[PDB]
Amino acid sequence: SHMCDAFVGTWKLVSSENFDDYMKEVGVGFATRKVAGMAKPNMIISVNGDVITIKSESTFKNTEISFILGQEFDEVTADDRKVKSTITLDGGVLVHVQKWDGKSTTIKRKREDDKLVVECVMKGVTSTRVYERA
């Protein structure tokens, strides 16, 4: 058993704010922003030993990352950036940093009440996305 337990399960998007703006900041093109912004993903978090898996399933894309906390990995994002990612647990929050082309973005995932809150930041543009158990 582990503190990451609080994240495990199947989650459904219930609200999004400022995500088109965040995606613009990151450099996502118009057509991708439109189609990804329409997506209503289900997000499946699981843990097997030290390996955490986060899967997103939507009509836009079905993606998945697996990782060990603190240990860099290379990720291809749904908008086709090739980034170096590191995810750590800080004070109960999963902190995901992606670095590419001298740029960086941080994605925080946290449990608040019965929700899983996703906060995405690029420069000083923040987007908040709220998920509930499916």
Ligand X SMILES: CCSC1=NC(=O)CC(=O)N1C1CCCCC1
- Interacting residue ranges for ligand X, rule: CB under 6 A: 23, 28, 36, 39, 41, 43, 54-56, 58, 63-65, 77-79, 107, 118, 120, 129
| CA dist., res. 113 & res. 60, Å (int) | 28
| CA dist., res. 44 & res. 113, Å (int) | 18
DSSP string for 38-76: H---EEEEEEETTEEEEEEE-SS-EEEEEE-TT--EEEE
Question: What's the min distance (Å) between Cβ of 83 and ligand X?
Answer: 8
Question: What's the min distance (Å) between Cβ of 127 and ligand X?
Answer: 8
| CA dist., res. 77 & res. 63, Å (int) | 9
118 belongs to an annotated ligand binding site: no
Question: What's the min distance (Å) between Cβ of 74 and ligand X?
Answer: 12
Nearer to ligand X, 1 or 112 (CB): 112
- Bind-site residues for a fatty acid: 129-131
